[PDB]
């Protein structure tokens, strides 16, 4: 149905995302159980990790477009990522390695992430109708890999240990690399301009030096979240100051602030909603016992099923408003499940968490899939920098917010943890409802400004 290189990119993307979500799915639990972090420390350290993973994506589009070439930067990103996964597996022998290894994943992700999508765009003549479908299948690829990883990685970590899990993350990257190298012939005429001139060793060295520097800076920020906080505050206030000095941009600003709220909520899946499933939900659904950490897999599950349907099925600000209302309902549903529909021992039906994640995934499908594509219709390099900066800030804020659900290690009664989750999730749902309403009110004015 699609060009042959589409299937190469599909499977490279699938396996790379498998590696990443294999780590993401178990990391907060790894912080608590293996490194002995409190839930509070684990949640804020995960927040810093997620911020760097997301904020560094800005580098890889630039590196691929202008320094080394899209295909070369796919190869380099894949290698740095696999190195990071094996380093994480090695952190169990050498615990002092952990932050450097996670920073290597962050920098590796930064180099890799923007580039497969870029390549896929060049597989089609410029106004090809199949583009829309191909990109929906690309997103589905991301979420099939994520689905497999969030499903299987906690089970693997429970049965064989973290070293095995992280090494398999690395192996998934190695097999992304093998599938790319085996398929190189499919993309001989596909690439950015640097792909077709000889590689500049000068720029390659600049990219490796900066990468290593960034790996160390990431390790540091993640070990010392209290200064990452101030770094991002001063960076945010400064880039806001310089954005205000320099009106289709004002619409980009309000849409960015709304995206920040969305990412604060998205950040809860591996942290507060994860420990909510652990502590206050039954770990049995349709008669099968499951690892509760696997409940995170419900997000890609619903994306995998819902992206075709919603592809079959106002315009920008109204899609954003709807997504914000969906997210609001996910958290109000979590709160409602805890307040009214819990067992006498404090446990709630897993169908409520299935519904929380359906709502949250629909919110994702309206906002982040459809965000920077026509944030790109309103606009430049500066706003990409500001976008990634603010969303990294959003992930830090999300870790901090998750800490309000943190449970001490000595608590064992679900009736003690249930009101904490319920208070926080209900308050999140109410604030997101207020935000969704203000978004709705501004939808007409926002939609006027786009003309």
């Amino acid at each position, epitope marked *: 149905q699609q060009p042959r290189p589409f299937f190469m990119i599909f499977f490279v993307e699938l396996w790379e995302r498998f590696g990443y979500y294999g780590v993401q799915g178990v990391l907060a639990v790894f912080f608590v159980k293996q490194l002995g972090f409190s839930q509070e420390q684990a949640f804020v350290t995960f927040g810093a990790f997620a911020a760097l993973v997301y904020g560094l994506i800005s580098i890889g589009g630039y590196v691929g477009d202008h320094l080394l070439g899209t295909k070369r930067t796919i190869v380099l990103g894949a290698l740095v990522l696999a190195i990071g996964y094996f380093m994480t597996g090695m952190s169990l022998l050498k615990p002092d390695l952990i932050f450097i290894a996670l920073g290597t994943i962050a920098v590796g992700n930064g180099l890799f992430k923007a580039n497969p999508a870029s390549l896929l765009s060049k597989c089609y003549p410029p106004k090809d109708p199949r583009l829309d479908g191909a990109f929906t299948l690309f997103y589905m690829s991301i979420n099939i890999g994520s689905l497999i990883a969030l499903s299987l990685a906690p089970v693997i970590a429970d049965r064989f240990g973290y070293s095995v899990t992280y090494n398999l993350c690395g192996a998934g990257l190695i097999i992304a690399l093998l599938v790319y190298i085996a398929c190189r012939g499919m993309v001989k005429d596909i690439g950015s301009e640097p792909d077709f001139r000889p590689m500049s060793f000068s720029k390659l060295l600049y990219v490796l030096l900066g990468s290593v520097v960034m790996i160390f800076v990431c390790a540091w920020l993640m070990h010392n979240v209290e200064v990452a906080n101030l770094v991002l505050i001063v960076l945010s206030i400064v880039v806001t100051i310089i954005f205000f000095r320099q009106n289709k941009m004002f619409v980009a600003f309000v849409l960015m602030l709304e995206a920040v709220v969305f990412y604060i909520l998205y950040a809860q899946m591996p942290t507060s909603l994860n420990f909510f499933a652990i502590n206050n939900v039954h770990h049995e659904i349709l008669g099968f016992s499951i690892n*509760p950490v696997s409940f995170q897999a419900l997000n890609p599950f619903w994306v995998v099923l819902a992206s075709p349907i919603l592809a079959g099925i106002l315009s920008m600000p109204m899609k954003f408003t709807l997504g914000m209302f969906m997210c609001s309902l996910g958290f109000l549903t979590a709160a409602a499940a805890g307040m009214w529909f819990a*067992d006498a021992q404090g*446990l709630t039906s897993p169908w409520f968490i299935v519904l929380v994640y359906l709502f949250q995934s629909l919110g994702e499908l309206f906002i982040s899939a459809l965000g920077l594509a026509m944030i790109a219709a309103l606009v430049m390099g500066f706003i990409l920098g500001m976008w990634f900066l603010t969303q990294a800030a959003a992930f830090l804020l999300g870790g901090y917010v998750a800490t309000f659900t943190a449970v001490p*290690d000595n608590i*064992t*009664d*679900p009736l003690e943890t249930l009101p904490v989750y319920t208070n926080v999730f209900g308050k999140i749902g109410l604030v997101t409802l207020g935000v969704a309403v203000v978004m709705l009110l501004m939808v007409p004015w926002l939609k006027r400004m786009i003309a």
Partner: nanobody, 122 residues
Framework: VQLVESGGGLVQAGGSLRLSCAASGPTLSNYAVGWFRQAPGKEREFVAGINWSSGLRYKDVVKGRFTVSRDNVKDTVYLQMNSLKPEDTAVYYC?????????????????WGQGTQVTVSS
């Protein structure tokens, strides 16, 4: 996923017994392990447990007599039962739930040992 209990038996009032729970494939370290007991003609009731991070929970009538502990090297959970009484006679089960919570009812636990008879004679 399957727990093996060991260490039951018959003991006189005021004596002591130790139960142990071990798991096959999954490392027990990630699990709250609760000990339940069923006396003749009554329901399983929570007795005592340790969560995945050394937090403890006890039924009121066994406090000051029972101690739950964990040897994370041997991947085993222990119930040390001192000052035993006739009304402690029951089948004892260990049960395992992922995470930090020790819910009071059997339905909170997915994995169950087969049960060990503990009898305390007057």
């Amino acid at each position: 996923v399957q727990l093996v209990e060991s260490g039951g038996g018959l003991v006189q009032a005021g004596g002591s017994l130790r139960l142990s729970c071990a798991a096959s494939g999954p490392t027990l370290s990630n699990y709250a392990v609760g000990w339940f007991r069923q006396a003749p003609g009554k329901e399983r009731e929570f007795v005592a447990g340790i969560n995945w991070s050394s937090g403890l929970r006890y039924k009121d009538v066994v406090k000051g007599r029972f101690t739950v502990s964990r040897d994370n090297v041997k991947d085993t959970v222990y119930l040390q039962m001192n000052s035993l009484k006739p009304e402690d006679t029951a089948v004892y089960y260990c049960a395992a739930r992922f995470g930090g919570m020790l819910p009071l009812q059997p339905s909170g636990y997915a994995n169950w040992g087969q049960g060990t008879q503990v009898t305390v004679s007057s």
